[PDB]
Design an enzyme around this catalytic site. Sequence first.
Site, PDB file in Angstrom:
ATOM      1  N   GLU A 197     -32.854  -4.096  31.443  1.00  0.00           N
ATOM      2  CA  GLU A 197     -31.552  -4.557  30.963  1.00  0.00           C
ATOM      3  C   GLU A 197     -31.301  -4.389  29.481  1.00  0.00           C
ATOM      4  O   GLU A 197     -32.246  -4.423  28.851  1.00  0.00           O
ATOM      5  CB  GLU A 197     -31.475  -6.273  31.181  1.00  0.00           C
ATOM      6  CG  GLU A 197     -30.288  -6.854  30.804  1.00  0.00           C
ATOM      7  CD  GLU A 197     -30.496  -8.525  30.684  1.00  0.00           C
ATOM      8  OE1 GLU A 197     -31.307  -8.836  31.220  1.00  0.00           O
ATOM      9  OE2 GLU A 197     -29.354  -8.786  30.206  1.00  0.00           O
ATOM     10  N   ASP A 199     -29.302  -5.819  26.257  1.00  0.00           N
ATOM     11  CA  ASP A 199     -28.275  -6.694  25.716  1.00  0.00           C
ATOM     12  C   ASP A 199     -27.792  -6.145  24.411  1.00  0.00           C
ATOM     13  O   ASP A 199     -28.634  -6.122  23.295  1.00  0.00           O
ATOM     14  CB  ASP A 199     -28.882  -7.873  25.557  1.00  0.00           C
ATOM     15  CG  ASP A 199     -29.178  -8.548  26.780  1.00  0.00           C
ATOM     16  OD1 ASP A 199     -28.620  -8.349  27.764  1.00  0.00           O
ATOM     17  OD2 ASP A 199     -30.447  -9.239  26.932  1.00  0.00           O
ATOM     18  N   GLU A 202     -24.935 -10.508  22.427  1.00  0.00           N
ATOM     19  CA  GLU A 202     -25.159 -11.790  22.780  1.00  0.00           C
ATOM     20  C   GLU A 202     -25.000 -12.608  21.661  1.00  0.00           C
ATOM     21  O   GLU A 202     -25.753 -12.621  20.558  1.00  0.00           O
ATOM     22  CB  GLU A 202     -26.407 -12.441  23.445  1.00  0.00           C
ATOM     23  CG  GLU A 202     -26.674 -11.882  24.796  1.00  0.00           C
ATOM     24  CD  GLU A 202     -27.888 -12.052  25.287  1.00  0.00           C
ATOM     25  OE1 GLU A 202     -28.805 -11.385  25.192  1.00  0.00           O
ATOM     26  OE2 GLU A 202     -28.193 -13.192  25.979  1.00  0.00           O
ATOM     27  N   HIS A 213     -34.513  -5.062  26.972  1.00  0.00           N
ATOM     28  CA  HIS A 213     -35.398  -5.655  28.139  1.00  0.00           C
ATOM     29  C   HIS A 213     -35.800  -4.636  29.132  1.00  0.00           C
ATOM     30  O   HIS A 213     -35.296  -4.749  30.107  1.00  0.00           O
ATOM     31  CB  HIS A 213     -35.053  -6.699  28.639  1.00  0.00           C
ATOM     32  CG  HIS A 213     -34.309  -8.140  28.042  1.00  0.00           C
ATOM     33  ND1 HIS A 213     -35.056  -9.275  27.726  1.00  0.00           N
ATOM     34  CD2 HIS A 213     -33.111  -8.204  27.313  1.00  0.00           C
ATOM     35  CE1 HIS A 213     -34.255 -10.099  27.086  1.00  0.00           C
ATOM     36  NE2 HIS A 213     -33.231  -9.504  26.860  1.00  0.00           N
TER      37      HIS A 213
HETATM   38  O1  LIG Z   1     -28.451 -17.854  32.262  1.00  0.00           O
HETATM   39  C1  LIG Z   1     -27.642 -17.301  33.240  1.00  0.00           C
HETATM   40  C2  LIG Z   1     -26.687 -16.342  32.589  1.00  0.00           C
HETATM   41  O2  LIG Z   1     -27.213 -14.989  32.333  1.00  0.00           O
HETATM   42  C3  LIG Z   1     -26.427 -14.316  31.599  1.00  0.00           C
HETATM   43  O3  LIG Z   1     -27.026 -12.796  31.560  1.00  0.00           O
HETATM   44  C4  LIG Z   1     -28.279 -12.841  30.707  1.00  0.00           C
HETATM   45  C5  LIG Z   1     -29.418 -12.034  31.338  1.00  0.00           C
HETATM   46  O4  LIG Z   1     -29.824 -13.389  32.280  1.00  0.00           O
HETATM   47  C6  LIG Z   1     -30.535 -12.216  30.146  1.00  0.00           C
HETATM   48  O5  LIG Z   1     -31.740 -11.703  30.889  1.00  0.00           O
HETATM   49  C7  LIG Z   1     -29.870 -11.376  29.174  1.00  0.00           C
HETATM   50  O6  LIG Z   1     -31.203 -11.268  28.209  1.00  0.00           O
HETATM   51  O7  LIG Z   1     -28.687 -11.805  28.482  1.00  0.00           O
HETATM   52  C8  LIG Z   1     -27.909 -11.876  29.524  1.00  0.00           C
HETATM   53  C9  LIG Z   1     -26.381 -12.227  28.867  1.00  0.00           C
HETATM   54  O8  LIG Z   1     -26.395 -13.561  28.351  1.00  0.00           O
HETATM   55  C10 LIG Z   1     -25.169 -13.923  32.477  1.00  0.00           C
HETATM   56  O9  LIG Z   1     -24.491 -13.069  31.410  1.00  0.00           O
HETATM   57  C11 LIG Z   1     -24.415 -15.295  32.633  1.00  0.00           C
HETATM   58  O10 LIG Z   1     -23.115 -14.974  33.446  1.00  0.00           O
HETATM   59  C12 LIG Z   1     -25.289 -16.218  33.302  1.00  0.00           C
HETATM   60  O11 LIG Z   1     -24.687 -17.630  33.450  1.00  0.00           O
END
Ligand SMILES: OC[C@H]1O[C@@H](O[C@H]2[C@H](O)[C@@H](O)[C@H](O)O[C@@H]2CO)[C@H](O)[C@@H](O)[C@@H]1O
Length: 398
Positions: A197, A199, A202, A213
């Site tokens: 993943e 990000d 955020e 990640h």
């Molecule tokens: O906590 C649940 C929440 O996760 C969100 O995705 C995360 C992903 O789990 C995490 O590994 C990463 O580091 O960031 C993303 C984005 O915040 C997802 O976007 C949400 O809808 C969910 O409720």
Amino acid sequence: QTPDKAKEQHPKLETYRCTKASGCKKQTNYIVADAGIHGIRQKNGAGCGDWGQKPNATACPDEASCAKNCILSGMDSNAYKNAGITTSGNKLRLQQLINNQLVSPRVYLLEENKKKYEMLHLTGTEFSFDVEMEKLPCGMNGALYLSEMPQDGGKSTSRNSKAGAYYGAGYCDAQCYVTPFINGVGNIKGQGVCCNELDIWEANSRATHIAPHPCSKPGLYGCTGDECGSSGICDKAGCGWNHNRINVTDFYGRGKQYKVDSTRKFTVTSQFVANKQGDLIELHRHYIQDNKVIESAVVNISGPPKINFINDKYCAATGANEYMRLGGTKQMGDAMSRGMVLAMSVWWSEGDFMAWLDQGVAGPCDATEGDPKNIVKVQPNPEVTFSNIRIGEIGSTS
Ligand SMILES: OC[C@H]1O[C@@H](O[C@H]2[C@H](O)[C@@H](O)[C@H](O)O[C@@H]2CO)[C@H](O)[C@@H](O)[C@@H]1O
Ligand SMILES: *[C@@H]1O[C@H](CO)[C@@H](O)[C@H](O)[C@H]1NC(C)=O
Ligand SMILES: *[C@@H]1O[C@H](CO)[C@@H](O)[C@H](O)[C@H]1NC(C)=O
């Protein structure tokens, strides 16, 4: 699950592909809500299982039974609107609540044909988006990221998988959470659903975070036992970059005392630099506000190299041990080179209040304002608008 016959009216979203020589060309893409948001239920109205668990054992003793017993309802525009998702030209608006209900949407980008996710290969390229963060207080998380989800939503993995990308099946991320459905089929074994993943974004109006990640398994992997933990196959923590954590607390925030003012629209440009071998080596970030390029600030703490971007040296110097252990920046770039899905969401956390993003060294929030109960006091309708997504050669998207 099995989709019903109700019409699915995915919101349209204009996006751009750009080159230095020809500029940015507009393209039609579609937005799809996650499979779960569509509503997956048994015939007696019960659900098929909750986040964190295997699917309901009566409706889903096995995959075929699970597929027969759990129906996913199509979503018309109204369903999308009530799910907190609307689009306009090149903008995507995500609302945390609609008519007093927690909707907190998570959506994916679809190719113009709607049958497959638009796979983005970002290694060696640039990605830019415009965002409106004023309505996101402490504790909120407006996210734009990428996950290495199956392009067809996991359809090809089983005869029982039917939702596909068209209905938002196939979600995975680096936390390897146990979800009731995996690859569009009942998660009978209760495996954690993992995948690489990236990000990119955020944030909330008080703090922003960047974090690649890596995972040692390509594509979507159903982990078991310790494969799902801290020392398992995915880097849960990630290699983060938050200006507050490297001691540059005036870089981003609400108002005039910050270089990037979170109460007004701004552009976020990310550059994924590859070395001669085509491997990812550096993640760069710069912003554009008021027609000015605002560069990221150099590390302002002792330890890490004096740079304003992510790299293995930086990551190792900041304690991203799992990140380094799982292959670091190169491992992350391999997932990006294979192609990943663009996810956009809005959420809050009843459990930690997003403290890792905006409290203590990560930002200016106290220990309780980010509680969802307080969040609605500060801002009754938390929301975020991501728009003008432009992908293309480095130097051509913004
Ligand atoms: O906590 C649940 C929440 O996760 C969100 O995705 C995360 C992903 O789990 C995490 O590994 C990463 O580091 O960031 C993303 C984005 O915040 C997802 O976007 C949400 O809808 C969910 O409720
Ligand atoms: C599982 O579904 C059955 C209906 O077929 C229902 O009896 C039961 O309450 C559900 N289980 C949970 C844990 O909700
Ligand atoms: C943060 O930077 C300021 C200088 O701008 C300095 O006074 C302070 O010691 C630094 N703190 C850390 C965590 O190094």
